[PDB]
Amino acid sequence: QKVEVDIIDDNFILRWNVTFSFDYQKTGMDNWIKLSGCQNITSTKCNFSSNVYEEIKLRIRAEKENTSSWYEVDSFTPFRKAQIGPPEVHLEAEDKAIVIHISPGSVMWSFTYSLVIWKNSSGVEERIENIYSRHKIYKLSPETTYCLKVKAALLTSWKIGVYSPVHCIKTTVENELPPPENIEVSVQNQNYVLKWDYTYANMTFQVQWLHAFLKRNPYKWKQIPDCENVKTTQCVFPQNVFQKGIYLLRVQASDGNNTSFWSEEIKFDT
Template structure:
């Protein structure tokens, strides 16, 4: 009735204005339009518009909140709210209803069901409604989900105390969502650990969701909570609830875990070493397991497998060379075995072959005096084992530094760098003299310098003729394949 009555008043007012204008029917449409516009403004003024509209995103949960200054509360006023967002069509944009936020009888709504693109920019606004009346639109809110999203606490944290350490398994924030905002592999984690009854906390960074915390006191209750970090800490999540576990008492009769596990890598030779107390007897053997870091992080939680060459090892080291390729990253662990007793695994150690390996000295350096020149033959590091470093990805640019000095001096006289097969260095008016040299391989691609070769010396013949020092780098397996472009660098 109220709506019909106002329309009637508007029409009467319009007719009166036309009559006052001398019955000019030409003005009637304009005057009627003005009256209707006045009616629209009057209708929008009946309900206050929503204010302070805010979007809150946590993981993939989207919530919209706003304030409303009505003379009564929303329920008593029988007011609802509707939200529209701007959608781009082929040649134009149109405001469409936002799923989950239409005819809402509260000053908030959940639009997680809208299935928004996390990287797209969105615009939305809200209006109040009561029957056929509606308020003016709120101010437009602009947001990109990925930019404003907060990281929630981990979806689940499983904590277990075993063998004097804490094993922790973390389910990434939002991983139970149908379409997660982030991949589980994008996260690292921060653990706050304390002894029960103490406020002193220790922060521990975890690189993956399945880690262990060691070096703990026996027979002690520890409490911890976890939060996720994105992009190396650029964005941090909320902490999980606190979890408490009790470590077991130390048992002198139980085999300890191998400690100080480390890898020595030279060229393509990789050896795993660890510390062990020989007082535990001669019947102890060791088992080494390997897991590719990619499999552990992206594919399988149980990615560990025994290294064939490291089963029933009786020493505190084993050769991993057959297990490692230069592509990828690996993790290794070792445990002690005595009869049927198997001790807990050591702390895992990560190996990135390209970064961790050292370039060894050249496999062979030969020097010979031929006529008026010194000839030097160099074999690539690792070539004596048929695994030349020149064949390894990241070391294809392998080159050499050659240092030359008189045997009577402690300072080198000449230093040159070259990857070419022939290099000459003029040396004029030499007296009979003994010259020494050493060679070092280096790779600019991997930013590594290798070990020096053994020092070798040779004595030149007397004479006034210039002696030419010739450096011939024989590529052995590669000389028939291709020649590399040369470069001459000033020695540092």
């Protein structure tokens, strides 16, 4: 019989009427030191928050009513062994898009995220890489249940993380007003010209902008005043309303009563 130990975030996890007690020592040491709060537990997990680049060994004392055995584990460095735990995920849905809110699931530990998504009916998985912690997936079908799981990563330290539990959400009934489409910027004179397509006539629109870098690991979208409630599928505004830089633009439609969901966010490099 022998034991190994895995680490997820701040927990030692044992892999093989019994209780467990954990000791450790720094490698090249005589005696064993008890890990506080990890003595006579039923759980195979020991939370050790309270120096992860130092080499250590563990000793696990497996006890019963009248007998016990003490197993040592090979030397390890906790950081090198650690696995990143499953992130916490919350989903929200529109008719044709899903928004994924992600946050870490702390002593051991910036994270890069990835996900896997599939339609419940089909099970065909699409993998999306390098997503951020409020990612939006477009081009989905209304009243359709999608399922997904998310993992964290630390590409610098070559760690690939554990997937969150699966979460599913059903997209809502189709919005009668679809989002504006095909958004494009061009320049005329000292102005920018924002153009888009729309499926219905006699609509009004609004355009909002955001500094693009603000999207990472999160800010208020702001109106472009000239574009506010425009009655056609374009607006013209002075170049000098934006400093040089990288922005995001989005457009929403209205019939005076209801609004579409937002168009996709488009990159705007001045």
